Structures are given as C-alpha cells and as structure tokens.
Design an enzyme around this catalytic site. Sequence first.
Site, PDB file in Angstrom:
ATOM      1  N   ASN A   9       1.298   7.703   2.950  1.00  0.00           N
ATOM      2  CA  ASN A   9       1.779   6.850   4.030  1.00  0.00           C
ATOM      3  C   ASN A   9       3.253   7.125   4.334  1.00  0.00           C
ATOM      4  O   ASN A   9       3.908   6.359   5.049  1.00  0.00           O
ATOM      5  CB  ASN A   9       1.564   5.374   3.686  1.00  0.00           C
ATOM      6  CG  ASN A   9       0.091   5.017   3.533  1.00  0.00           C
ATOM      7  OD1 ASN A   9      -0.780   5.718   4.047  1.00  0.00           O
ATOM      8  ND2 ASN A   9      -0.190   3.921   2.836  1.00  0.00           N
ATOM      9  N   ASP A  49       2.487   3.379   7.405  1.00  0.00           N
ATOM     10  CA  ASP A  49       1.359   2.472   7.556  1.00  0.00           C
ATOM     11  C   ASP A  49       1.609   1.103   6.967  1.00  0.00           C
ATOM     12  O   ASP A  49       1.627   0.918   5.752  1.00  0.00           O
ATOM     13  CB  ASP A  49       0.069   3.053   6.994  1.00  0.00           C
ATOM     14  CG  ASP A  49      -1.013   2.001   6.846  1.00  0.00           C
ATOM     15  OD1 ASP A  49      -1.851   1.850   7.755  1.00  0.00           O
ATOM     16  OD2 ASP A  49      -1.015   1.315   5.812  1.00  0.00           O
ATOM     17  N   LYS A  90       1.469   4.144  -0.893  1.00  0.00           N
ATOM     18  CA  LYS A  90       1.109   5.468  -1.376  1.00  0.00           C
ATOM     19  C   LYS A  90       1.823   6.589  -0.626  1.00  0.00           C
ATOM     20  O   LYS A  90       2.212   6.425   0.527  1.00  0.00           O
ATOM     21  CB  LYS A  90      -0.407   5.675  -1.407  1.00  0.00           C
ATOM     22  CG  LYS A  90      -1.146   5.446  -0.111  1.00  0.00           C
ATOM     23  CD  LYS A  90      -2.495   4.856  -0.454  1.00  0.00           C
ATOM     24  CE  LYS A  90      -3.482   4.979   0.674  1.00  0.00           C
ATOM     25  NZ  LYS A  90      -4.756   4.332   0.268  1.00  0.00           N
ATOM     26  N   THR A 118      15.322 -20.032  -0.277  1.00  0.00           N
ATOM     27  CA  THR A 118      14.331 -20.741  -1.068  1.00  0.00           C
ATOM     28  C   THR A 118      14.480 -22.240  -0.821  1.00  0.00           C
ATOM     29  O   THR A 118      13.650 -23.043  -1.252  1.00  0.00           O
ATOM     30  CB  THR A 118      14.518 -20.454  -2.569  1.00  0.00           C
ATOM     31  OG1 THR A 118      15.893 -20.645  -2.925  1.00  0.00           O
ATOM     32  CG2 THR A 118      14.123 -19.023  -2.897  1.00  0.00           C
ATOM     33  N   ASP A 176       0.845  -1.190   0.000  1.00  0.00           N
ATOM     34  CA  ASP A 176       0.000   0.000   0.000  1.00  0.00           C
ATOM     35  C   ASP A 176       0.881   1.240   0.000  1.00  0.00           C
ATOM     36  O   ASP A 176       0.629   2.197   0.738  1.00  0.00           O
ATOM     37  CB  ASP A 176      -0.895  -0.002   1.238  1.00  0.00           C
ATOM     38  CG  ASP A 176      -2.005   1.036   1.168  1.00  0.00           C
ATOM     39  OD1 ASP A 176      -2.696   1.102   0.131  1.00  0.00           O
ATOM     40  OD2 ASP A 176      -2.206   1.773   2.157  1.00  0.00           O
TER      41      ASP A 176
HETATM   42  C1  LIG Z   1      -5.713   4.593  10.244  1.00  0.00           C
HETATM   43  O1  LIG Z   1      -4.822   5.665  10.214  1.00  0.00           O
HETATM   44  C2  LIG Z   1      -3.587   5.486   9.920  1.00  0.00           C
HETATM   45  O2  LIG Z   1      -3.169   4.328   9.663  1.00  0.00           O
HETATM   46  C3  LIG Z   1      -2.626   6.649   9.884  1.00  0.00           C
HETATM   47  C4  LIG Z   1      -1.622   6.563   8.847  1.00  0.00           C
HETATM   48  N1  LIG Z   1      -0.839   6.468   8.069  1.00  0.00           N
HETATM   49  C5  LIG Z   1      -2.025   6.694  11.221  1.00  0.00           C
HETATM   50  C6  LIG Z   1      -1.180   7.935  11.428  1.00  0.00           C
HETATM   51  C7  LIG Z   1       0.017   7.739  12.277  1.00  0.00           C
HETATM   52  C8  LIG Z   1       0.335   6.376  12.807  1.00  0.00           C
HETATM   53  C9  LIG Z   1       0.864   5.366  11.930  1.00  0.00           C
HETATM   54  C10 LIG Z   1       1.132   4.055  12.418  1.00  0.00           C
HETATM   55  C11 LIG Z   1       0.841   3.745  13.853  1.00  0.00           C
HETATM   56  C12 LIG Z   1       1.122   2.416  14.383  1.00  0.00           C
HETATM   57  C13 LIG Z   1       0.314   4.722  14.704  1.00  0.00           C
HETATM   58  C14 LIG Z   1       0.037   6.061  14.204  1.00  0.00           C
HETATM   59  C15 LIG Z   1       0.701   9.036  12.571  1.00  0.00           C
HETATM   60  C16 LIG Z   1       1.873   9.446  13.336  1.00  0.00           C
HETATM   61  N2  LIG Z   1       2.648   8.495  14.085  1.00  0.00           N
HETATM   62  N3  LIG Z   1       2.235  10.799  13.345  1.00  0.00           N
HETATM   63  C17 LIG Z   1       1.503  11.742  12.644  1.00  0.00           C
HETATM   64  N4  LIG Z   1       0.369  11.378  11.894  1.00  0.00           N
HETATM   65  C18 LIG Z   1      -0.037  10.054  11.847  1.00  0.00           C
HETATM   66  N5  LIG Z   1      -1.174   9.428  11.154  1.00  0.00           N
HETATM   67  C19 LIG Z   1      -2.117  10.216  10.324  1.00  0.00           C
HETATM   68  C20 LIG Z   1      -1.875  10.358   8.838  1.00  0.00           C
HETATM   69  C21 LIG Z   1      -3.075  10.793   8.032  1.00  0.00           C
HETATM   70  O3  LIG Z   1      -3.490  12.107   8.164  1.00  0.00           O
END
Ligand SMILES: COC(=O)[C@H](C#N)Cc1c(-c2ccc(C)cc2)c2c(N)ncnc2n1/C=C/CO
Length: 299
Positions: free
Chosen positions: A130, A147, A127, A167, A125
């Site tokens: 992320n 993500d 993108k 493998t 994913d």
């Molecule tokens: C369901 O939502 C998601 O999955 C987000 C994404 N990507 C999580 C996110 C995080 C984040 C990523 C992974 C984990 C384990 C916890 C939080 C995070 C972070 N650590 N700092 C700033 N913005 C963050 N965001 C928001 C991005 C979108 O505006």
Amino acid sequence: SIQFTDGYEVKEDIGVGSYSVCKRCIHKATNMEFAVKIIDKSKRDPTEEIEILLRYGQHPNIITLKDVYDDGKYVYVVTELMKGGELLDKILRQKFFSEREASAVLFTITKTVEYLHAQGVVHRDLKPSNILYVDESGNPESIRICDFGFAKQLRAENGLLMTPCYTANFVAPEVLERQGYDAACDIWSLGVLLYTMLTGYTPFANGPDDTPEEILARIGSGKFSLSGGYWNSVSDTAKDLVSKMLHVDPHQRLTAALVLRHPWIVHWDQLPQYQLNRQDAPHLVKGAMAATYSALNRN
Ligand SMILES: COC(=O)[C@H](C#N)Cc1c(-c2ccc(C)cc2)c2c(N)ncnc2n1/C=C/CO
Ligand code: NA
C-alpha cells in the site's frame, strides 16, 4: 453532480478486489493520466476513506485526491497515478541499497504516520504493497501511502472527530485502548517493512507456502533473528530500532514519536552508505508478505 464518464477516458485495470477495482484513466481535456478507484456502493460504503483523503491528502506523502463522483451505484475516486511502482519491491531489486537510505525511507514514512496518529487516524492495513513511489526518482519525497480502505478516525459517541490530545471530552475506554492498539500495529507493520528492507527477507514467513498457523506461531513467539548471515553487516543501532518496533508486547512497542527519536533515525548522517548484504528474492518476499497479512487479516 454531473459525470465522470464525461471527464475521463477509462483504460486498463491496475488492481482488483471484491469491493472495488482501480483503473488507469485519462483526463480528456488535458491528456493527463490518473488512477481511479471504483467502489461498489451496495458492497461497501467508502465515505470514511474519502473524508480521510479529503482531510489529509494534502500531506506531501499521502496520496492526493483529484476528483470524485457518485454515479449512483458506484463511487469513482480519482488520484495522482503512482508511476514508480511499489516501494519495497523497488528497494529489494536494488543490489546496492544502504542503511543510510533505509533510514531516509523509514523517516519519511514514520513522519507521515506520526501525523495521522496525532490527528486520531490509524491506518490499520499498513502493508508494504500500500506504499508506492509516485515517479522513478527513487527519492523519499516520492513516497505515498495509498490505501486508506481500512483507516479509522477516532470519533465521539456523538459522531464527532477527536484527537488523542483532546481527551477532555469523555469517550469509551476499550476504544482508546483500541486506537492505542491499532496505532501499535501500524508501527509493527513498519517494523516488518524495516526488517525486510535491511536483509532482503521478512521476519515471519519464508514464502507464500508458509501456512497461517505457522506464521502466527512465529509472530506469537516474540522472537526473530537479528543475527547471522545478512544481519552481520547491519549496525547495532538499526537492529536495536527493529527489536523495539516489532516488540511482541503492544504496550512496549515504540510509538512513531519515539521511532523518530531513535538515533538510527536521528543520526542518519552516521549511517553507512556502502551496501547492505541482503538475500535477493523480491518475489519470494512478496509471497511471504502476502502470507503474513492473509493470516493476520482473516477477520
Ligand atoms: C482496490 O485497489 C486498491 O485499493 C489499490 C491500492 N492500493 C488502488 C491503487 C491506486 C489507488 C489508491 C487509492 C485511490 C483512491 C485510487 C487509486 C493506484 C494509484 N493512484 N496509482 C498506481 N497504482 C494504484 N493502485 C494499484 C496498486 C496495486 O497493484
Ligand atoms: Na498528497
């Protein structure tokens, strides 16, 4: 097995989906801010994501896990809070961005991806949204892939972790082709990222108005512009590199290993540090971008 509510003061939302929302939070003891993903256990099972993070979030450019809790109905995944916003958007809002710098950015990201693939992890994913900056230094070092909601480690039928190198234990055919396929997509997503970086627009969609069939026809044609307007200014080195990352044939798409051996990446020192001539419409790109993955991901 005690508490999250206890360790942290919960603040506002920063992202939201049907399986989980991210909120900003405070470690009460210390007063340091962090993000926390809250996953609904009855909706989704987040264990592969989390292992992937436990195993690999020590990587300087992978987001770093700081805690975790199982409320019972909910997981709470605590990480560093990314303060520099999304990568591509900050890059696009930079009137004086250069090839030299784009090379440093792609290098950092690909190096990270070459490592995941070598460990048998495909992201799936990949993108631009992320991919965040941890602070505002605008340094490559502050890049994080964030993500792993869709990431998958190669596993043995018996449920045992595996690498491409080993493998020498047998496993399913259509699955190695699957993981090879899924890594090819990761590279492809970095291709579109690179494309957008250099010219200020996406290769397959003009805005959030582009219909999915219209975007899928474009992706399917194999062809895209590497000339005219904004392309004029870009060295053939890079354009060559892009042609091969977006290569319509997944078997022909450069690997991350081969991306790192391309001269655009290698002779970064020969790259122009004067400005790219790019379209200036960050938000239009955000729309196009979202449209491209929505169309790709409706399954
Ligand atoms: C369901 O939502 C998601 O999955 C987000 C994404 N990507 C999580 C996110 C995080 C984040 C990523 C992974 C984990 C384990 C916890 C939080 C995070 C972070 N650590 N700092 C700033 N913005 C963050 N965001 C928001 C991005 C979108 O505006
Ligand atoms: Na990390």
